[PDB]
Amino acid sequence: KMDSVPGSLVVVGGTYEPWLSVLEQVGWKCHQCADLRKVDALLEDIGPCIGIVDLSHDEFSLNGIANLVSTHKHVRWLAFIREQQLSSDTICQFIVNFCIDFFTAPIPDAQLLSTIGHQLGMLKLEKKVWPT
């Protein structure tokens, strides 16, 4: 027993990231923004979802992100990063403390879909208890 129909994902992340299209092609509703006040609101009505935080451009104050990710403990957060940032202790600490997985830029479709897809089970238990 497992889940495979794609759901919704919020991408706290500026710049078009190519991987986004591979999810939209397979059925994901891909909410996206670079402004955080809107994602906090959107995430309040969306409820539980997959969240991908783009840290791969010195584009967001990783202060502003982790405040968001902190506020929404029941989103399944994945980190997107450049391979180079695996060398950064600060980045590895954020991922390990606030995300459940990560992936880097050139990645095959099947790996990417499997990494998101593997959160669909959890995403259902999050929803069972969301009326908290």
Side-chain angles (χ1 to χ4, degrees), residues 58-115:
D58 171 87
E59 208 163 17
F60 298 87
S61 322
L62 273 79
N63 194 34
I65 286 139
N67 296 325
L68 217 56
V69 180
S70 306
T71 305
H72 302 292
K73 199 256 153 304
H74 286 27
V75 164
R76 306 255 95 204
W77 291 103
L78 285 83
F80 177 77
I81 54 154
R82 331 172 301 268
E83 269 197 13
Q84 191 274 331
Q85 312 173 258
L86 289 177
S87 82
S88 164
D89 260 351
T90 277
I91 298 265
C92 293
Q93 291 172 314
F94 166 102
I95 299 156
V96 115
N97 280 333
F98 294 110
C99 306
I100 66 237
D101 208 345
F102 71 97
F103 61 106
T104 53
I107 165 171
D109 298 337
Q111 243 63 70
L112 172 67
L113 299 180
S114 245
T115 284

Short mmCIF file of all heavy atoms in Angstrom, two decimals, residues 58-115:
data_model
loop_
_atom_site.label_atom_id
_atom_site.label_comp_id
_atom_site.label_asym_id
_atom_site.label_seq_id
_atom_site.Cartn_x
_atom_site.Cartn_y
_atom_site.Cartn_z
N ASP A 58 22.63 32.32 -3.76
CA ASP A 58 22.70 33.28 -2.67
C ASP A 58 21.62 34.33 -2.93
O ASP A 58 21.90 35.51 -3.20
CB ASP A 58 24.12 33.85 -2.60
CG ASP A 58 24.24 35.02 -1.66
OD1 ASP A 58 24.47 34.78 -0.45
OD2 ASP A 58 24.15 36.18 -2.13
N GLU A 59 20.36 33.88 -2.87
CA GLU A 59 19.17 34.58 -3.34
C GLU A 59 18.20 34.88 -2.22
O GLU A 59 17.52 35.92 -2.26
CB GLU A 59 18.42 33.72 -4.37
CG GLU A 59 17.61 34.48 -5.41
CD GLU A 59 17.26 33.61 -6.61
OE1 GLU A 59 17.36 32.37 -6.49
OE2 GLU A 59 16.89 34.16 -7.67
N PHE A 60 18.10 33.99 -1.24
CA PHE A 60 17.25 34.16 -0.08
C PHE A 60 18.14 34.25 1.15
O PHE A 60 19.11 33.49 1.28
CB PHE A 60 16.28 32.99 0.08
CG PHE A 60 15.31 32.83 -1.05
CD1 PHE A 60 15.65 32.08 -2.16
CD2 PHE A 60 14.06 33.43 -1.00
CE1 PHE A 60 14.77 31.94 -3.21
CE2 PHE A 60 13.17 33.27 -2.04
CZ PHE A 60 13.52 32.54 -3.15
N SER A 61 17.81 35.16 2.05
CA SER A 61 18.41 35.12 3.37
C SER A 61 18.03 33.80 4.02
O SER A 61 16.88 33.64 4.44
CB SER A 61 17.94 36.29 4.23
OG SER A 61 17.83 37.47 3.45
N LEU A 62 18.97 32.85 4.11
CA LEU A 62 18.68 31.60 4.80
C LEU A 62 18.20 31.81 6.23
O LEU A 62 17.86 30.83 6.91
CB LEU A 62 19.91 30.69 4.80
CG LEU A 62 20.13 29.76 3.61
CD1 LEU A 62 20.72 30.51 2.41
CD2 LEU A 62 21.00 28.57 4.01
N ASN A 63 18.23 33.07 6.70
CA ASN A 63 17.42 33.50 7.84
C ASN A 63 15.94 33.49 7.48
O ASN A 63 15.13 32.87 8.17
CB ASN A 63 17.86 34.92 8.24
CG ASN A 63 17.34 35.35 9.59
OD1 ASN A 63 17.20 34.54 10.51
ND2 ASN A 63 17.12 36.65 9.74
N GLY A 64 15.58 34.19 6.40
CA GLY A 64 14.18 34.27 6.03
C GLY A 64 13.56 32.91 5.76
O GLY A 64 12.40 32.67 6.11
N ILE A 65 14.32 32.01 5.14
CA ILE A 65 13.81 30.67 4.86
C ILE A 65 13.54 29.92 6.15
O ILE A 65 12.43 29.46 6.41
CB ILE A 65 14.79 29.86 3.99
CG1 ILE A 65 14.79 30.32 2.54
CG2 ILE A 65 14.45 28.38 4.09
CD1 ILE A 65 16.18 30.35 2.01
N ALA A 66 14.58 29.74 6.96
CA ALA A 66 14.43 28.85 8.10
C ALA A 66 13.39 29.36 9.07
O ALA A 66 12.82 28.56 9.83
CB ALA A 66 15.78 28.65 8.78
N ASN A 67 13.10 30.66 9.05
CA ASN A 67 11.94 31.17 9.79
C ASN A 67 10.65 30.61 9.21
O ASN A 67 9.77 30.18 9.96
CB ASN A 67 11.94 32.70 9.76
CG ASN A 67 13.15 33.30 10.47
OD1 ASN A 67 13.62 32.77 11.47
ND2 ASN A 67 13.66 34.41 9.93
N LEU A 68 10.54 30.59 7.88
CA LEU A 68 9.40 29.96 7.23
C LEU A 68 9.33 28.49 7.58
O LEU A 68 8.35 28.02 8.18
CB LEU A 68 9.50 30.14 5.72
CG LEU A 68 8.19 30.37 4.99
CD1 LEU A 68 7.46 31.56 5.57
CD2 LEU A 68 8.47 30.56 3.50
N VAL A 69 10.38 27.74 7.24
CA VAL A 69 10.41 26.30 7.48
C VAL A 69 10.17 25.98 8.95
O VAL A 69 9.50 25.00 9.28
CB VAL A 69 11.75 25.72 6.97
CG1 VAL A 69 11.82 24.23 7.21
CG2 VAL A 69 11.91 26.01 5.49
N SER A 70 10.67 26.83 9.85
CA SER A 70 10.37 26.65 11.28
C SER A 70 8.88 26.76 11.53
O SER A 70 8.29 25.93 12.23
CB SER A 70 11.11 27.69 12.12
OG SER A 70 12.51 27.69 11.85
N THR A 71 8.25 27.77 10.93
CA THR A 71 6.84 28.07 11.17
C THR A 71 5.93 26.95 10.70
O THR A 71 4.82 26.78 11.22
CB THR A 71 6.49 29.38 10.46
OG1 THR A 71 7.39 30.41 10.90
CG2 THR A 71 5.06 29.80 10.75
N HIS A 72 6.38 26.17 9.72
CA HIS A 72 5.55 25.17 9.04
C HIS A 72 6.20 23.80 9.19
O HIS A 72 6.65 23.21 8.20
CB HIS A 72 5.36 25.58 7.57
CG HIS A 72 4.73 26.94 7.40
ND1 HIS A 72 3.43 27.21 7.75
CD2 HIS A 72 5.24 28.10 6.93
CE1 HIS A 72 3.15 28.47 7.50
NE2 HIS A 72 4.23 29.04 7.00
N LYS A 73 6.23 23.28 10.42
CA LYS A 73 6.86 22.00 10.72
C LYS A 73 6.18 20.82 10.03
O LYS A 73 6.75 19.72 10.00
CB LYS A 73 6.88 21.78 12.24
CG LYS A 73 7.90 20.72 12.74
CD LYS A 73 7.21 19.39 13.12
CE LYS A 73 8.16 18.19 12.96
NZ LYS A 73 8.73 18.06 11.57
N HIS A 74 4.98 21.00 9.47
CA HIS A 74 4.25 19.89 8.87
C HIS A 74 4.23 19.96 7.34
O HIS A 74 3.36 19.36 6.70
CB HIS A 74 2.85 19.85 9.46
CG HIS A 74 2.83 19.32 10.86
ND1 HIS A 74 3.91 19.43 11.71
CD2 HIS A 74 1.86 18.69 11.57
CE1 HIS A 74 3.63 18.88 12.87
NE2 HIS A 74 2.39 18.42 12.82
N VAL A 75 5.18 20.67 6.75
CA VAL A 75 5.49 20.56 5.33
C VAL A 75 6.67 19.61 5.21
O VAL A 75 7.58 19.63 6.04
CB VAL A 75 5.81 21.93 4.71
CG1 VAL A 75 6.48 21.76 3.38
CG2 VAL A 75 4.56 22.74 4.56
N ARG A 76 6.66 18.77 4.18
CA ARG A 76 7.77 17.85 3.95
C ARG A 76 8.82 18.60 3.13
O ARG A 76 8.73 18.67 1.91
CB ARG A 76 7.29 16.61 3.22
CG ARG A 76 6.16 15.90 3.91
CD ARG A 76 6.67 14.66 4.57
NE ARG A 76 7.01 14.84 5.97
CZ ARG A 76 7.87 14.05 6.60
NH1 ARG A 76 8.53 13.11 5.93
NH2 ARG A 76 8.07 14.21 7.90
N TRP A 77 9.82 19.17 3.82
CA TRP A 77 10.78 20.09 3.21
C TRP A 77 11.99 19.34 2.66
O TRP A 77 12.64 18.57 3.37
CB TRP A 77 11.25 21.15 4.21
CG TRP A 77 10.21 22.17 4.62
CD1 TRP A 77 9.52 22.20 5.80
CD2 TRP A 77 9.77 23.31 3.87
NE1 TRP A 77 8.66 23.29 5.83
CE2 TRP A 77 8.80 23.98 4.65
CE3 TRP A 77 10.08 23.82 2.60
CZ2 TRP A 77 8.15 25.13 4.21
CZ3 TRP A 77 9.42 24.95 2.15
CH2 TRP A 77 8.47 25.60 2.95
N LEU A 78 12.27 19.58 1.39
CA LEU A 78 13.48 19.13 0.72
C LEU A 78 14.33 20.35 0.39
O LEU A 78 13.80 21.43 0.14
CB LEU A 78 13.14 18.37 -0.56
CG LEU A 78 12.60 16.96 -0.38
CD1 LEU A 78 11.12 17.00 -0.11
CD2 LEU A 78 12.85 16.21 -1.65
N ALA A 79 15.64 20.17 0.42
CA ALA A 79 16.57 21.26 0.14
C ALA A 79 17.14 21.08 -1.25
O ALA A 79 17.52 19.97 -1.63
CB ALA A 79 17.72 21.29 1.15
N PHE A 80 17.19 22.16 -2.01
CA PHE A 80 17.88 22.17 -3.29
C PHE A 80 19.12 23.04 -3.19
O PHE A 80 19.05 24.18 -2.74
CB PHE A 80 16.99 22.68 -4.41
CG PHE A 80 17.70 22.75 -5.70
CD1 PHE A 80 17.94 21.60 -6.43
CD2 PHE A 80 18.20 23.96 -6.17
CE1 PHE A 80 18.62 21.65 -7.63
CE2 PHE A 80 18.89 24.02 -7.37
CZ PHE A 80 19.10 22.86 -8.10
N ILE A 81 20.24 22.50 -3.62
CA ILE A 81 21.52 23.14 -3.38
C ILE A 81 22.44 22.82 -4.54
O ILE A 81 22.21 21.89 -5.30
CB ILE A 81 22.14 22.66 -2.05
CG1 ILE A 81 22.21 21.14 -2.04
CG2 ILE A 81 21.34 23.20 -0.82
CD1 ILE A 81 23.28 20.65 -1.15
N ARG A 82 23.50 23.61 -4.66
CA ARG A 82 24.60 23.28 -5.55
C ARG A 82 25.55 22.38 -4.79
O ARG A 82 25.87 22.64 -3.62
CB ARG A 82 25.33 24.54 -6.05
CG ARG A 82 24.45 25.80 -6.15
CD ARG A 82 25.27 27.09 -6.46
NE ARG A 82 26.31 27.40 -5.48
CZ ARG A 82 26.13 28.19 -4.42
NH1 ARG A 82 24.96 28.73 -4.15
NH2 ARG A 82 27.17 28.44 -3.63
N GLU A 83 26.00 21.33 -5.46
CA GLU A 83 27.00 20.40 -4.97
C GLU A 83 28.08 21.08 -4.13
O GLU A 83 28.50 20.54 -3.10
CB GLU A 83 27.65 19.67 -6.16
CG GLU A 83 26.96 18.37 -6.55
CD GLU A 83 27.84 17.47 -7.44
OE1 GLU A 83 29.06 17.74 -7.54
OE2 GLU A 83 27.31 16.51 -8.04
N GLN A 84 28.52 22.26 -4.56
CA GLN A 84 29.52 23.00 -3.80
C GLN A 84 29.09 23.27 -2.35
O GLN A 84 29.94 23.36 -1.47
CB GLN A 84 29.84 24.31 -4.51
CG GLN A 84 31.05 25.03 -3.95
CD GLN A 84 30.69 25.93 -2.79
OE1 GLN A 84 29.56 26.44 -2.70
NE2 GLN A 84 31.63 26.12 -1.87
N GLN A 85 27.78 23.43 -2.09
CA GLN A 85 27.34 23.79 -0.74
C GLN A 85 27.29 22.61 0.21
O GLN A 85 27.14 22.82 1.42
CB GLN A 85 25.97 24.44 -0.77
CG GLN A 85 25.81 25.54 -1.80
CD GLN A 85 24.37 26.00 -1.87
OE1 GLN A 85 23.65 25.63 -2.79
NE2 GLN A 85 23.94 26.77 -0.89
N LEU A 86 27.41 21.39 -0.30
CA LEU A 86 27.64 20.25 0.57
C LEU A 86 28.92 20.41 1.39
O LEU A 86 29.11 19.70 2.37
CB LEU A 86 27.71 18.96 -0.25
CG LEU A 86 26.38 18.48 -0.84
CD1 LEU A 86 26.60 17.23 -1.69
CD2 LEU A 86 25.37 18.24 0.29
N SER A 87 29.81 21.30 0.98
CA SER A 87 31.04 21.56 1.71
C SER A 87 30.84 22.55 2.85
O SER A 87 31.77 22.77 3.63
CB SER A 87 32.09 22.09 0.73
OG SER A 87 31.90 23.47 0.51
N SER A 88 29.65 23.12 2.98
CA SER A 88 29.38 24.18 3.94
C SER A 88 28.67 23.58 5.14
O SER A 88 27.59 22.97 5.01
CB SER A 88 28.55 25.30 3.30
OG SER A 88 27.97 26.14 4.28
N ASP A 89 29.27 23.76 6.32
CA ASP A 89 28.72 23.20 7.54
C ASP A 89 27.37 23.83 7.85
O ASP A 89 26.42 23.14 8.23
CB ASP A 89 29.71 23.44 8.68
CG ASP A 89 30.55 22.20 9.01
OD1 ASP A 89 30.25 21.12 8.46
OD2 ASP A 89 31.49 22.31 9.82
N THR A 90 27.26 25.14 7.67
CA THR A 90 26.01 25.85 7.87
C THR A 90 24.87 25.26 7.03
O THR A 90 23.73 25.12 7.51
CB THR A 90 26.24 27.32 7.51
OG1 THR A 90 26.81 27.99 8.64
CG2 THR A 90 24.98 28.01 7.07
N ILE A 91 25.15 24.91 5.77
CA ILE A 91 24.10 24.39 4.91
C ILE A 91 23.75 22.97 5.32
O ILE A 91 22.58 22.60 5.39
CB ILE A 91 24.54 24.47 3.44
CG1 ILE A 91 24.78 25.93 3.04
CG2 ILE A 91 23.52 23.81 2.54
CD1 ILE A 91 23.61 26.58 2.38
N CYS A 92 24.76 22.16 5.60
CA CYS A 92 24.49 20.80 6.04
C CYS A 92 23.71 20.80 7.35
O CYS A 92 22.86 19.93 7.57
CB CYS A 92 25.80 20.02 6.16
SG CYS A 92 26.61 19.75 4.55
N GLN A 93 23.94 21.79 8.21
CA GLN A 93 23.18 21.84 9.47
C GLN A 93 21.72 22.21 9.24
O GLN A 93 20.84 21.68 9.93
CB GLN A 93 23.81 22.82 10.45
CG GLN A 93 25.15 22.35 10.99
CD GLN A 93 25.86 23.42 11.81
OE1 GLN A 93 25.94 24.58 11.41
NE2 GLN A 93 26.37 23.02 12.97
N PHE A 94 21.44 23.11 8.29
CA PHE A 94 20.04 23.46 8.03
C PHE A 94 19.29 22.26 7.48
O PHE A 94 18.18 21.94 7.91
CB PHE A 94 19.95 24.64 7.05
CG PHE A 94 18.57 24.87 6.45
CD1 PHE A 94 17.75 25.88 6.93
CD2 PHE A 94 18.13 24.12 5.37
CE1 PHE A 94 16.50 26.10 6.37
CE2 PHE A 94 16.88 24.33 4.82
CZ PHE A 94 16.06 25.33 5.33
N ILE A 95 19.90 21.57 6.51
CA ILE A 95 19.22 20.44 5.89
C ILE A 95 18.94 19.36 6.92
O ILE A 95 17.82 18.83 7.01
CB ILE A 95 20.07 19.89 4.74
CG1 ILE A 95 20.25 21.01 3.71
CG2 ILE A 95 19.44 18.60 4.21
CD1 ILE A 95 21.47 20.89 2.82
N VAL A 96 19.93 19.04 7.74
CA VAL A 96 19.78 17.94 8.67
C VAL A 96 18.75 18.29 9.75
O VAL A 96 18.05 17.41 10.26
CB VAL A 96 21.17 17.58 9.23
CG1 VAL A 96 21.27 17.84 10.69
CG2 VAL A 96 21.47 16.14 8.90
N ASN A 97 18.60 19.57 10.08
CA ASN A 97 17.72 19.97 11.17
C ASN A 97 16.34 20.40 10.71
O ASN A 97 15.44 20.50 11.55
CB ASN A 97 18.37 21.10 11.96
CG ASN A 97 19.41 20.57 12.94
OD1 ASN A 97 19.33 19.42 13.38
ND2 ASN A 97 20.43 21.38 13.23
N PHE A 98 16.15 20.68 9.43
CA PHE A 98 14.88 21.22 8.95
C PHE A 98 14.34 20.52 7.71
O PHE A 98 13.21 20.82 7.31
CB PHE A 98 14.99 22.72 8.64
CG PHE A 98 15.24 23.60 9.85
CD1 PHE A 98 16.47 24.23 10.03
CD2 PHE A 98 14.25 23.82 10.79
CE1 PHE A 98 16.71 25.05 11.13
CE2 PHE A 98 14.48 24.64 11.88
CZ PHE A 98 15.72 25.25 12.05
N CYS A 99 15.09 19.63 7.08
CA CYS A 99 14.61 18.99 5.87
C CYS A 99 14.65 17.48 6.06
O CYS A 99 15.27 16.97 6.99
CB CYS A 99 15.43 19.42 4.65
SG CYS A 99 15.47 21.20 4.49
N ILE A 100 13.99 16.76 5.15
CA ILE A 100 14.04 15.31 5.17
C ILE A 100 14.83 14.74 4.01
O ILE A 100 15.09 13.53 3.99
CB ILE A 100 12.63 14.70 5.19
CG1 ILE A 100 11.93 15.04 3.88
CG2 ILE A 100 11.83 15.22 6.39
CD1 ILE A 100 10.68 15.76 4.09
N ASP A 101 15.23 15.56 3.04
CA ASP A 101 16.06 15.09 1.94
C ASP A 101 16.61 16.31 1.22
O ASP A 101 16.25 17.45 1.53
CB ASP A 101 15.31 14.18 0.97
CG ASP A 101 16.22 13.18 0.28
OD1 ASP A 101 17.45 13.38 0.33
OD2 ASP A 101 15.71 12.21 -0.32
N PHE A 102 17.50 16.06 0.26
CA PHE A 102 18.10 17.09 -0.57
C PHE A 102 18.37 16.50 -1.95
O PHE A 102 18.29 15.29 -2.16
CB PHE A 102 19.41 17.63 0.04
CG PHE A 102 20.58 16.66 0.00
CD1 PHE A 102 21.53 16.73 -1.01
CD2 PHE A 102 20.74 15.68 0.99
CE1 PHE A 102 22.62 15.84 -1.06
CE2 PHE A 102 21.82 14.79 0.96
CZ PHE A 102 22.77 14.88 -0.08
N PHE A 103 18.65 17.39 -2.90
CA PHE A 103 19.10 17.00 -4.23
C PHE A 103 19.82 18.19 -4.85
O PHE A 103 19.67 19.32 -4.39
CB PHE A 103 17.95 16.49 -5.11
CG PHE A 103 16.87 17.50 -5.37
CD1 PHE A 103 16.76 18.11 -6.61
CD2 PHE A 103 15.94 17.81 -4.41
CE1 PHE A 103 15.76 19.04 -6.86
CE2 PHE A 103 14.94 18.73 -4.65
CZ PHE A 103 14.85 19.34 -5.88
N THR A 104 20.64 17.90 -5.85
CA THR A 104 21.50 18.86 -6.49
C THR A 104 21.19 18.90 -7.98
O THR A 104 20.52 18.01 -8.52
CB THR A 104 22.99 18.53 -6.28
OG1 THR A 104 23.25 17.18 -6.68
CG2 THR A 104 23.38 18.71 -4.81
N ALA A 105 21.75 19.92 -8.65
CA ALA A 105 21.22 20.44 -9.91
C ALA A 105 21.06 19.35 -10.98
O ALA A 105 19.92 18.95 -11.24
CB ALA A 105 22.07 21.62 -10.41
N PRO A 106 22.12 18.82 -11.62
CA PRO A 106 21.88 17.85 -12.70
C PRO A 106 21.57 16.48 -12.13
O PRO A 106 22.45 15.78 -11.62
CB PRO A 106 23.20 17.87 -13.49
CG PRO A 106 24.08 18.89 -12.78
CD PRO A 106 23.56 18.96 -11.38
N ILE A 107 20.30 16.08 -12.22
CA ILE A 107 19.78 14.88 -11.57
C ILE A 107 18.79 14.22 -12.53
O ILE A 107 17.96 14.91 -13.12
CB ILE A 107 19.10 15.23 -10.23
CG1 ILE A 107 18.24 14.07 -9.73
CG2 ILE A 107 18.21 16.44 -10.38
CD1 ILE A 107 17.74 14.27 -8.34
N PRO A 108 18.86 12.91 -12.73
CA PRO A 108 17.95 12.26 -13.67
C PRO A 108 16.50 12.32 -13.21
O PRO A 108 16.21 12.35 -12.01
CB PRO A 108 18.45 10.81 -13.71
CG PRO A 108 19.87 10.88 -13.25
CD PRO A 108 19.90 11.99 -12.23
N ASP A 109 15.58 12.33 -14.19
CA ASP A 109 14.15 12.42 -13.88
C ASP A 109 13.74 11.40 -12.83
O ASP A 109 13.08 11.73 -11.84
CB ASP A 109 13.31 12.23 -15.15
CG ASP A 109 13.57 13.30 -16.21
OD1 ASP A 109 14.02 14.43 -15.89
OD2 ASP A 109 13.30 13.00 -17.39
N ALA A 110 14.16 10.14 -13.01
CA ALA A 110 13.74 9.06 -12.13
C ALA A 110 14.23 9.27 -10.70
O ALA A 110 13.50 8.96 -9.75
CB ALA A 110 14.24 7.72 -12.68
N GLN A 111 15.45 9.78 -10.51
CA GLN A 111 15.90 10.06 -9.16
C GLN A 111 15.06 11.15 -8.52
O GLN A 111 14.63 11.02 -7.36
CB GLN A 111 17.37 10.45 -9.15
CG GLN A 111 18.21 9.46 -8.38
CD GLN A 111 18.19 8.08 -9.00
OE1 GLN A 111 18.76 7.87 -10.07
NE2 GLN A 111 17.52 7.14 -8.33
N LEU A 112 14.82 12.23 -9.25
CA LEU A 112 14.07 13.35 -8.71
C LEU A 112 12.65 12.93 -8.36
O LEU A 112 12.17 13.19 -7.24
CB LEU A 112 14.07 14.49 -9.72
CG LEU A 112 13.15 15.65 -9.36
CD1 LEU A 112 13.67 16.36 -8.12
CD2 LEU A 112 13.01 16.60 -10.53
N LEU A 113 11.96 12.26 -9.28
CA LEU A 113 10.60 11.81 -9.01
C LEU A 113 10.56 10.84 -7.85
O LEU A 113 9.55 10.75 -7.14
CB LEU A 113 10.00 11.15 -10.24
CG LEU A 113 9.85 11.98 -11.51
CD1 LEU A 113 9.24 11.13 -12.65
CD2 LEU A 113 9.01 13.20 -11.23
N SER A 114 11.60 10.05 -7.68
CA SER A 114 11.55 9.07 -6.61
C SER A 114 11.77 9.73 -5.26
O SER A 114 11.25 9.26 -4.25
CB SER A 114 12.59 7.97 -6.84
OG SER A 114 11.94 6.74 -7.06
N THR A 115 12.54 10.81 -5.24
CA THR A 115 12.84 11.46 -3.98
C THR A 115 11.62 12.20 -3.47
O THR A 115 11.28 12.10 -2.28
CB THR A 115 14.03 12.38 -4.18
OG1 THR A 115 15.21 11.58 -4.24
CG2 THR A 115 14.14 13.32 -3.01
#
